[PDB]
Amino acid sequence: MRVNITLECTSCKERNYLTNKNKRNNPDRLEKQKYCPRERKVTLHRET
Amino acid sequence: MRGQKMNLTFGLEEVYEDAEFHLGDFDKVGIVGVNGAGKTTLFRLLLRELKLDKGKITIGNSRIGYLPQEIIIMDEKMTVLEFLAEGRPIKKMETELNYIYEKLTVVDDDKQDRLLKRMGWLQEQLEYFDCYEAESILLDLVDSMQIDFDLFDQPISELSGGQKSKISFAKVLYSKPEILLLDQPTNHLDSSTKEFVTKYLKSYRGSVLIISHDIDFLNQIIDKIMYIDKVTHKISIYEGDYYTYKKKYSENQLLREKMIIQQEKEVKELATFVQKAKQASQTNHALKRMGLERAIRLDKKKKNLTKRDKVYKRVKMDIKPNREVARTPLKVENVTFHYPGHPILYKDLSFQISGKERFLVVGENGVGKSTLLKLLMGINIPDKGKIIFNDKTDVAYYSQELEQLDEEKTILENVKSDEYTDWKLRATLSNFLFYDDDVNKKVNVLSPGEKARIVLCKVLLQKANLLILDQPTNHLDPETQSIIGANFNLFEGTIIVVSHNPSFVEQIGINRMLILPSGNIDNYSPELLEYYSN
RNA sequence: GGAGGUAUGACAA
RNA sequence: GCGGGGUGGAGCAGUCAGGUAGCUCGUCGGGCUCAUAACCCGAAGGUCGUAGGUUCAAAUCCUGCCCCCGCAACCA
RNA sequence: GUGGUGGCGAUAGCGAGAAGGAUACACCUGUUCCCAUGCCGAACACAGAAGUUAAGCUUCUUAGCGCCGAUUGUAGUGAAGGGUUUCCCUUUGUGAGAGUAGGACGUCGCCACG
RNA sequence: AUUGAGUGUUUGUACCACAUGUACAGGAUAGGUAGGAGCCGAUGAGACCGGAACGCUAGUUUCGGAGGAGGCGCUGGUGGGAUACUACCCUUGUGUUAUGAACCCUCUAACCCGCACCACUAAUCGUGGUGGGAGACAGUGUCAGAUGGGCAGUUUGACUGGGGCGGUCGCCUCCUAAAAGGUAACGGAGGCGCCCAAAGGUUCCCUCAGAAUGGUUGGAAAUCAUUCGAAGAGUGUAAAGGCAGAAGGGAGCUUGACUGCGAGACCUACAAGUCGAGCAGGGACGAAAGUCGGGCUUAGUGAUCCGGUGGUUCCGCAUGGAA
RNA sequence: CAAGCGACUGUUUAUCAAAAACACAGGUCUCUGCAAAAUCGUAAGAUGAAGUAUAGGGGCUGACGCCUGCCCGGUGCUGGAAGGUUAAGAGGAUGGGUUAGCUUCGGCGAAGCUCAGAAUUGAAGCCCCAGUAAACGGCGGCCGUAACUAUAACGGUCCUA
RNA sequence: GGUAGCGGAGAAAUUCCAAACGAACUUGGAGAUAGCUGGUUCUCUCCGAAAUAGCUUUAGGGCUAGCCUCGGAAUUGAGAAUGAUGGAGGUAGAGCACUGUUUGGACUAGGGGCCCAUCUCGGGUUACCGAAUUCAGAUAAACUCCGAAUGCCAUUCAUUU
RNA sequence: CGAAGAGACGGAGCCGCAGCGAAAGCGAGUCUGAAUAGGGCGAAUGAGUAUGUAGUCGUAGACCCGAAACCAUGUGAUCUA
RNA sequence: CCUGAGUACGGCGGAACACGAGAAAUUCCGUCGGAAUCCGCGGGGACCAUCCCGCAAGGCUAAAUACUCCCUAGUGACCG
RNA sequence: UACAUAGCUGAUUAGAGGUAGACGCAGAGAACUGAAACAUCUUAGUACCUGCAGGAAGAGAAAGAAAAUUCGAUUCCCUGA
Numbered sequence A: 001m002r003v004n005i006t007l008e009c010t011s012c013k014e015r016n017y018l019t020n021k022n023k024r025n026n027p028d029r030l031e032k033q034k035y036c037p038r039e040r041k042v043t044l045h046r047e048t
Numbered sequence B: 001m002r003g004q005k006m007n008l009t010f011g012l013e014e015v016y017e018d019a020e021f022h023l024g025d026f027d028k029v030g031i032v033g034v035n036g037a038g039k040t041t042l043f044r045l046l047l048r049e050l051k052l053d054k055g056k057i058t059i060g061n062s063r064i065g066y067l068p069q070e071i072i073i074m075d076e077k078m079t080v081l082e083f084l085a086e087g088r089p090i091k092k093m094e095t096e097l098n099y100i101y102e103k104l105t106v107v108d109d110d111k112q113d114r115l116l117k118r119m120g121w122l123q124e125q126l127e128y129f130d131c132y133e134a135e136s137i138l139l140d141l142v143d144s145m146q147i148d149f150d151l152f153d154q155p156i157s158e159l160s161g162g163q164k165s166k167i168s169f170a171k172v173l174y175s176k177p178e179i180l181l182l183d184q185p186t187n188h189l190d191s192s193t194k195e196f197v198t199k200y201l202k203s204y205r206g207s208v209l210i211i212s213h214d215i216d217f218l219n220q221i222i223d224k225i226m227y228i229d230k231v232t233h234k235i236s237i238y239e240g241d242y243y244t245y246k247k248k249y250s251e252n253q254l255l256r257e258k259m260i261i262q263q264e265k266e267v268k269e270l271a272t273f274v275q276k277a278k279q280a281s282q283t284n285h286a287l288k289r290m291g292l293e294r295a296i297r298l299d300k301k302k303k304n305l306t307k308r309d310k311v312y313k314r315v316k317m318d319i320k321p322n323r324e325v326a327r328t329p330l331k332v333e334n335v336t337f338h339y340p341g342h343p344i345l346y347k348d349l350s351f352q353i354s355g356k357e358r359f360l361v362v363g364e365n366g367v368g369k370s371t372l373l374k375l376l377m378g379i380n381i382p383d384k385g386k387i388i389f390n391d392k393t394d395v396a397y398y399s400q401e402l403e404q405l406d407e408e409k410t411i412l413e414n415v416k417s418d419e420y421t422d423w424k425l426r427a428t429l430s431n432f433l434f435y436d437d438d439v440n441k442k443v444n445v446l447s448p449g450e451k452a453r454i455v456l457c458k459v460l461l462q463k464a465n466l467l468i469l470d471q472p473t474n475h476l477d478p479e480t481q482s483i484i485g486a487n488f489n490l491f492e493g494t495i496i497v498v499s500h501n502p503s504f505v506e507q508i509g510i511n512r513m514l515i516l517p518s519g520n521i522d523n524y525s526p527e528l529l530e531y532y533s534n
Numbered sequence C: 001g002g003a004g005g006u007a008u009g010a011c012a013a
Numbered sequence D: 001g002c003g004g005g006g007u008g009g010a011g012c013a014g015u016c017a018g019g020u021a022g023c024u025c026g027u028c029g030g031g032c033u034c035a036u037a038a039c040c041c042g043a044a045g046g047u048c049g050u051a052g053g054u055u056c057a058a059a060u061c062c063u064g065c066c067c068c069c070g071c072a073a074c075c076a
Numbered sequence E: 001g002u003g004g005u006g007g008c009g010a011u012a013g014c015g016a017g018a019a020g021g022a023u024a025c026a027c028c029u030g031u032u033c034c035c036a037u038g039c040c041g042a043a044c045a046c047a048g049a050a051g052u053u054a055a056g057c058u059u060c061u062u063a064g065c066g067c068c069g070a071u072u073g074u075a076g077u078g079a080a081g082g083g084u085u086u087c088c089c090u091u092u093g094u095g096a097g098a099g100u101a102g103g104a105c106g107u108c109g110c111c112a113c114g
Numbered sequence F: 001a002u003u004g005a006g007u008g009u010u011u012g013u014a015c016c017a018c019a020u021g022u023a024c025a026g027g028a029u030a031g032g033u034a035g036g037a038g039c040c041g042a043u044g045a046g047a048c049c050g051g052a053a054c055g056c057u058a059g060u061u062u063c064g065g066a067g068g069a070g071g072c073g074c075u076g077g078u079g080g081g082a083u084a085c086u087a088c089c090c091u092u093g094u095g096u097u098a099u100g101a102a103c104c105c106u107c108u109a110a111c112c113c114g115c116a117c118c119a120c121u122a123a124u125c126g127u128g129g130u131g132g133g134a135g136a137c138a139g140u141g142u143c144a145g146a147u148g149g150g151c152a153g154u155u156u157g158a159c160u161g162g163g164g165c166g167g168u169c170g171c172c173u174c175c176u177a178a179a180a181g182g183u184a185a186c187g188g189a190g191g192c193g194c195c196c197a198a199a200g201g202u203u204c205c206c207u208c209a210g211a212a213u214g215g216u217u218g219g220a221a222a223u224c225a226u227u228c229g230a231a232g233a234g235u236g237u238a239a240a241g242g243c244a245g246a247a248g249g250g251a252g253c254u255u256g257a258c259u260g261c262g263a264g265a266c267c268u269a270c271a272a273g274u275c276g277a278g279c280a281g282g283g284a285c286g287a288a289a290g291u292c293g294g295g296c297u298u299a300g301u302g303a304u305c306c307g308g309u310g311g312u313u314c315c316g317c318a319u320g321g322a323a
Numbered sequence G: 001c002a003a004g005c006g007a008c009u010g011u012u013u014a015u016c017a018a019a020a021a022c023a024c025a026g027g028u029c030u031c032u033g034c035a036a037a038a039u040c041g042u043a044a045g046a047u048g049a050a051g052u053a054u055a056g057g058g059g060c061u062g063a064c065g066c067c068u069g070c071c072c073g074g075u076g077c078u079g080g081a082a083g084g085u086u087a088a089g090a091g092g093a094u095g096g097g098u099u100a101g102c103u104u105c106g107g108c109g110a111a112g113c114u115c116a117g118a119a120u121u122g123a124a125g126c127c128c129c130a131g132u133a134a135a136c137g138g139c140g141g142c143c144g145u146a147a148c149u150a151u152a153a154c155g156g157u158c159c160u161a
Numbered sequence H: 001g002g003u004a005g006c007g008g009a010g011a012a013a014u015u016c017c018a019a020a021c022g023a024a025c026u027u028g029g030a031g032a033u034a035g036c037u038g039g040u041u042c043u044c045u046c047c048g049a050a051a052u053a054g055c056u057u058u059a060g061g062g063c064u065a066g067c068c069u070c071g072g073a074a075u076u077g078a079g080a081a082u083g084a085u086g087g088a089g090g091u092a093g094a095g096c097a098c099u100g101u102u103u104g105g106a107c108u109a110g111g112g113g114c115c116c117a118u119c120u121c122g123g124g125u126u127a128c129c130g131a132a133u134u135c136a137g138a139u140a141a142a143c144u145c146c147g148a149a150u151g152c153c154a155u156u157c158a159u160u161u
Numbered sequence I: 001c002g003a004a005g006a007g008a009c010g011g012a013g014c015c016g017c018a019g020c021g022a023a024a025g026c027g028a029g030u031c032u033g034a035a036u037a038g039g040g041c042g043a044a045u046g047a048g049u050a051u052g053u054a055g056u057c058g059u060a061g062a063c064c065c066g067a068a069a070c071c072a073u074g075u076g077a078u079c080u081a
Numbered sequence J: 001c002c003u004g005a006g007u008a009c010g011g012c013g014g015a016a017c018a019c020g021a022g023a024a025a026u027u028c029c030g031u032c033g034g035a036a037u038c039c040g041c042g043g044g045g046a047c048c049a050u051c052c053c054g055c056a057a058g059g060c061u062a063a064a065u066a067c068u069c070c071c072u073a074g075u076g077a078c079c080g
Numbered sequence K: 001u002a003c004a005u006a007g008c009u010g011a012u013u014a015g016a017g018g019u020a021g022a023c024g025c026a027g028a029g030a031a032c033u034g035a036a037a038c039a040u041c042u043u044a045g046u047a048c049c050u051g052c053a054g055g056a057a058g059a060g061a062a063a064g065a066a067a068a069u070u071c072g073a074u075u076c077c078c079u080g081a
C-alpha cells in the first residue's frame, strides 16, 4: 500500500514536504534530514 | 469518558477506524475482545500514554487508578514495600520538597517567590494525600487479601505470579483512585483470592472499567459491556452482562448476514438477465436494449452491495508427539527443595507419572506449584533427591510469566529453529493468527495474549511427548482457551499441568491430581473441590 | 378344558 | 464473440477471503451369511486440465494456451 | 631505444609466427607497516629486489579474418512526358547496395630516462 | 397548541426529619473541620431491669419500667487524628414534605355528536335550550418521520462507411507515415491509471548471456574451475530509441525524491505540457575535480467550483475583539 | 357435413376494424359494523342510502358440465412485536467568542450575553417472526441400468421455495 | 335537464365531449422557442477565401487557430525562387551482418520401431525423424551490415524577385 | 431660465494624469523572496477627453416568415357519451 | 407616578431584503415559547464589550412622482 | 325560559353596479423561455385572476443615515455603478 505523506519539520512544525512511501516496507514514520525554508537550515523532518 | 472519530494505526495494521464510545459516570464497564483487539490500547489512550492519529479522546479530570496487565518492576532488587509505596506520590514530593529547602538556603532573594509557591503546593498536596498512609498500607495488606508480612520485606521479582497480582491490585487500591481501570485484575489469582476482588468491585461505588477474559467474573460485576471488534476496528457498548452482549451481537450479525444474502440474490438476478441478453441474437433489438438497461441497474447494485466482514479466524492446534511415551516418563524420588532463606516447600517429595496421563499439580497461590515444574526442567537444582527422565521422554515447558521470548527480536526470529524451514514456520504462525508481515513485528510491541500464542507455538513445534504447562490459558481470549483445552485432550502424551481455571482442567480430563503443600498423589475427581475447601 | 365380547433363492432330477 | 466448466472411478466441496486436499456413492482386500444383497473393518485411487508468473508458501491470486458444454455469428 | 601521455573513423584491430630486456615496464619476493577479501595479501594496499624473460609488454614478419575501398555497370529516383496505365516505357539530372581493382600489420604530437 | 381536574404505580430532583461511621494502636464503635473549659440533670442524674435495631460480634443506638441525684469532659496515655457539648457539614439507609416526570386508570366544564325532545318555524338547513353519548381524546393549527407514478417537472452520451447490436472514449510505445516535423480510417500490434526508502544521490569498485571441458549428492538444467565468448545479457513495468568509458552490477556514506528561482529554448488555438545553463540559501558524497532539484529515456493522470487540514508581519463593516 | 373461437340476446373504434374484443348471468377473493368502505370537494355539502354484511365498494374469472395439482424462498398484503435502527421535540454535560477582575511580555478568568453542542429520552416505518397464491408471481439438471436392439419401470448425484 | 378540459363520460375502441381529442374550443403570456428549412430588394471598382487543426452531451452547431480583407507601426530586409556550402533524418532500392519466415545438400547430438543380449542393458539398420553446426539459395509494414533521389533546417553567402 | 429651440447656468459626477500587491501597504516603482539576486507587472519609452460619424458587438422579438407544443382566464353536453 | 405585552425577542417553518441559510444582521408571515421598562430599551450586517446614534410595539399629513377614457387649443424632415 | 336574549314589525342610515383595455396598493400567482440538456436558478413576483382605491396612490416626521463629524420626515430625478 503505497501512500502519499507529508514530512513535517520537527523544529518549527512546518509541513514542508510532499512525498510518498510504501507502508508495508516502511511501517514507522519516515524521518529525513531536509532543509526547512522557515528556519533556513537542515532539520530533522518526520512524517505526520 | 468519551471518544470521537478514533483512529489509530501502528504501521500497516490498524486498531481503531472511526470508532466511538461514550461511557456514563458510575458505570462498571466490561471491556471484551479477542487478543490484539485493542483493549489495552484503549486505556493507554485514556492515560494519555498514546495519542490518536486522528480523533478526540475525552477523559474526566478525576484521578485514575490503573492496574497494568503486566507487572512493572523498575529494578530487580525492589522490595514489595517499595513497590506498594510507589503507588502514592508521598515519597516523590518529599524528595522534591527536600531539594526545595536546600535551594532556599542557597538562594537569598532571587528565586524565593518561585520556591515559596512550589513549597506551599507540595505541603498542601502532601496533606491531601495524608502522610498517615504509612500505617494504613501496612494494614491494607491484612484486610485486603491476607498478604503475609514476610512478603512485605521480600523482593517483588521473587514473588509468585499469583502473589504479584495481589500486590499490584493492592497498589491500585492504595493510591485511593477515583476511576478504576483494571486490565485483567485476576490473571493469576486462585479461586479464594478472586472472591475478595469480586466483592470489592461489586461494592465499589465509583466507575470501574474491567478488561477480562473471565465471563463468570465479569457477569457478577458488569452492568455495561464494551466490545472491541477486531475485524471492524470499532467499539460497541451494550447494556447488561456478557451473555446479553453475546445475544445482542449474535442477532445483529445474523440480521446483517441475511441482508447481504438478499442483496446478492438481486445482483445475481440482474446478472442472469444481462447475460441472457448478452448472448441473444443481435437481431433481437428489444432484448439487447433491455440488457443494457439492466446492465446499468446491475452496476448501481454492485456499487451499493455491503461487504460481509471477514469472520475472525480461530486458532488451530494439532499437537502430536514425535516419539512415544513410556510407562514411567518421569521419576521423582525423595526430592526436597527450599529457596535460600525460606521454609522448605516440600520434603521427600516422591511421585511417578504413568504415561499419556493428565497430571494436575493443584494448590493455592504461593505454595510451590511453579517451583515444582521449574524443578523438573532443571531451572532449580533439588536440594535433596533425584529427578530422572526416561531417555524416551521429550519435555516442553510453558512458563507462567512468559519468560521464553526475546522482546528485542521479532516473532519469526523467536520461533526460528534448526529443525524447521521458513515456510514451515510461517504456516504454523498463520494457524496462530500471525498473518504475513505480522510475524516481523517485535515481540516487545505484542500484547500478553499474542505473546502467549508464540510461546504455545514454541511448545507445539517441539513435538515433545511430555508437556509441562504452567497456567496455559492465562492471557488467552475465551475462544482460544476452549480450543487449547480441546486439543490438549486429544494430545497423545503425558501432560503435567497447572491451572486455576476450572473450565480448562475439565476439558483436558485430568487423571491424577497432586495437592500442595500437603503432598497427596490422588486420583482426579470432584474431590478436587473437597481439597480446595480444606 | 372349550365357547361370542374387549430383502432375495436358474431349470430338470 | 457472450457465458459456464476442468480437484481420486463418477458426481461434488474447498476457489471470493493464500498456508492443512477432502465429502457422497462406487472400486479393491478382508469380515459377517448356506449363498447374494444390505452391513462391519481396512486399503487404494488426485500433487487440483496444462505452462509460465505473484508470494515465505497457490488447488486458491494473475496471465496465457489446449479441451468440454449452453448461446450468438445479423436485423426493414 | 624504452617508459609515460595524448590527437586522428580499426588503413590504428584480430589471429598466427619471430626477436628482445642495458635502463625502463613487468612477472616476481613478502604481509611488519596504512589498507584489503560478501572466503582467500588472487585482487586492492603496503614493504622489497633473489630470480626470470616464461607470460604481459615493446619491436619485427604475415592480410588468414576484420576494417577501408576508386572506376564501370545496374537498382532506385527529382524534373519533363508517354503508353498497351495494380504496371510499364522514354528523355534529362542524380545515383546506390552488391560485387570488385586496390589500400592497409597505422600515422601525428609532447614529456622523461638513454 | 387548543387542553382542564384527579387517583394510583414507578421514577428525577431539593429540602426536612431521622438514624450510620468499629483499619492497627488506644479507656474503646475518635466520620471531617472549627470553637471548646466547661457541659448535662427532681423541665427526673448515674446505676439497675426488660423490649427493639444495628452489628465488624467487641459492643453502639433507641423505647419503656422501677429508683431519686448525680454524671461527662478538661487534666492523664495511645494515635495521622482525642474524646464532653455546640456549629458547619460530608459518607450510609429509612421516612415525611416540595415535588419534575412515564404510565395507570377515573373524572368533567372545554371540544365533538350524519342521536332524541323543545323553541325560533311553514324547515330532515342553521342557531339556541334540555337530556343522552363521547371526552381531553377526537377534530383543527404548527412542526417532524414514514409511505406515496395517485399526480407533477425532467433526464435517459457521442463516434458509427444508415441506425441498432458489438467495439471505442484519457495517457504511453511502435508500424502505417511517403529518410525533418506533422499526418487519417470501427487500419495493424502492445502497454498505462504504478513501483522503489533504494530500484534515489554520490564515491569507489566490477562486467554479461551462453557454450565446451572436468567435477559427490546432482538429474537437460541449482553450486565450483578453466577456456572461449562484443553483447547474442541486463537495464522494476509495453515498445521504440539508448546504454557494457555503462544508463547494467556490488559496496560505504547518505536524503539533492533540496528551498527561492530561472537567461534561453522546444511544443502549442487556448489551458496546459517539455528542456534548461546559471544565481542565491543550506547541504550529500568526494582527497580534489566535481556530481546531485529522483529513477536509461518517453505512460503511472484530472481544470474550476466547493470542502478538509497545516502555516501566515494579510483583511477584520463605529472601535477592540470575534465571526 | 365438419373444425376453431366466443356460452347465449346484447356492446364497440360517429368517419378504413362488429370481432375471437367489451358486457353478461354464474364463480371466487378481498374490503366494509355504518359519520361503513369507496368516490366528488380546500371545506361545508353530497353520492354510497332514506341502503346496513342475503348490503355496499374493489380485483380477477366469465353460461353450463367435469375440474382447478405443487411452491409462502422472493415481492405485496395480514398479524406479531420482545430486540436492532430511527425525526421533530424534550434535555442540556462539556467546549468556543466576549470581559469585571486577576496577571511572573505569557496567560488565567466569575457573571451575563452568545456560537456550537454529547449522554439521556423519543412513534410509526424498516430490519426481523409467522401466515397468506381464484395475491404478485414461480413450477430443474447430469450419469448409469432389462436374456437382440432400442428404450429404459429401476439406481446414483447435484441444485431449488 | 345534470356531468367540462389538471376535466367529464365510456357494456373499454385512446371511445366521445359541436364535421381532425394520448387530452376540446377561444382569448391572453406571445413577436414562446426553432444550433432547422425558406426568403433578404440599386450599381460599378479593388482584393479574395475555406470545406483544415484542436476542444466540444460534439459531429449538418460553436469556439480559438489557419486561410481572406481593411488600416497602422517599425527593423542590420526579416518573404519567395535558384545556386553554393554545411547539417539532421533511415524511406526507395538493396542486403542479411541482427530478428522473424524459408529451400536444398553434407554431417550430426538426440529421437522412433526390429533382433541379440534383457538387470533393459551396449550395439547394427530404413539412403526411417532429425536439433545444432556448416555449404549453397530465398524472404520481410512493425528485420537492417548498408542506403539514395527528393524534401527539410541553416548561412550577416550569391543572383533575381 | 428659454420657442417642446439654440443657449446660459449647473463641477455633483465621469474619464485621463501611477503603478505594484490577495491584502496591510509602498510608490517610479512594486510584488515574490532571506536576498544588494533573478524574475513578473510597470516607469523609463504620455495623450487624453467631449461630441459627431461609420464598422462590429451586448441587452432588448434584434434581419423577416414558420412549428409541434407549454401555461393562465374564459366559452361549450343544441353533435356525441 | 407615566411613556403603547402576549408586544419586543427567541426556537421551528416560510417569505422579504440586490443578499439563493449563508458567518446573515435588518423586515415580515404561521406556530410555539416569551422581556425589560429610564440604574430602561433598540440599532451600528453573526456575537460580546466599549463608544456613538436613536426611543419600537398608536394614528394622520400638502408638494415634488405615475397615468390620460374624455375636453380645449395646437405641433410633426409622422401616414396619405 | 324566570328575568332576558334570539327572532319578528316598523322607522332611520348606508352600501349593492359601471368604468380608462391607463396609473396605485394588496391577495393569489404560471408557463413557454434562458441556463446552448436540466431539477437550484432564470423567465417573475412578470401574464392572468381577485379585492380596495384615489385623482393620484403608496411613503412619511427617526427605536434613521453615519463614523470627514456629523446629518436631521417622505417621495422623485442625476450620480454612486
Ligand SMILES: Nc1ncnc2c1ncn2[C@@H]1O[C@H](COP(=O)(O)OP(=O)(O)OP(=O)(O)O)[C@@H](O)[C@H]1O
Pocket: B158, B159, B160, B161, B162, B163, B164, B188, B190, B339, B340, B342, B363, B364, B365, B366, B367, B368, B369, B370, B371, B372, B400
Ligand atoms: N526466586 C525465589 N526466591 C525466593 N523465594 C521464592 C522464589 N521463588 C518463589 N519463592 C517463593 O516460593 C514460594 C512458592 O513458589 P512458586 O513460585 O512456585 O508459587 P506458585 O505455586 O507458582 O503460586 P502461583 O502461581 O499461584 O502464584 C512463594 O512464596 C514465593 O515467595
Ligand SMILES: Nc1ncnc2c1ncn2[C@@H]1O[C@H](COP(=O)(O)OP(=O)(O)OP(=O)(O)O)[C@@H](O)[C@H]1O
Pocket: B010, B011, B015, B033, B034, B035, B036, B037, B038, B039, B040, B041, B042, B069, B441, B445, B446, B447, B448, B449, B450, B475
Ligand atoms: N508499537 C506497536 N507497533 C506495532 N503494533 C502494535 C504496536 N502496539 C500495539 N500493536 C498492536 O496493537 C494491537 C492491539 O493492541 P493491544 O495490545 O491493546 O491488544 P489487547 O486486546 O489489549 O491484547 P490482550 O487482550 O491479549 O491483552 C496488538 O496486536 C499489537 O500487536
Ligand SMILES: [K+]
Pocket: none
Ligand atoms: K605482490
Ligand SMILES: [K+]
Pocket: E053, E055
Ligand atoms: K616476456
Ligand SMILES: [K+]
Pocket: E105
Ligand atoms: K591490420
Ligand SMILES: [K+]
Pocket: none
Ligand atoms: K387533542
Ligand SMILES: [K+]
Pocket: F161
Ligand atoms: K454504406
Ligand SMILES: [K+]
Pocket: none
Ligand atoms: K549506493
Ligand SMILES: [K+]
Pocket: G006
Ligand atoms: K366476443
Ligand SMILES: [K+]
Pocket: G007, G024
Ligand atoms: K358470454
Ligand SMILES: [K+]
Pocket: none
Ligand atoms: K369454455
Ligand SMILES: [K+]
Pocket: G018
Ligand atoms: K356483428
Ligand SMILES: [K+]
Pocket: G012, G021, G022
Ligand atoms: K370492445
Ligand SMILES: [K+]
Pocket: none
Ligand atoms: K367455471
Ligand SMILES: [K+]
Pocket: none
Ligand atoms: K366481484
Ligand SMILES: [K+]
Pocket: G060
Ligand atoms: K388474476
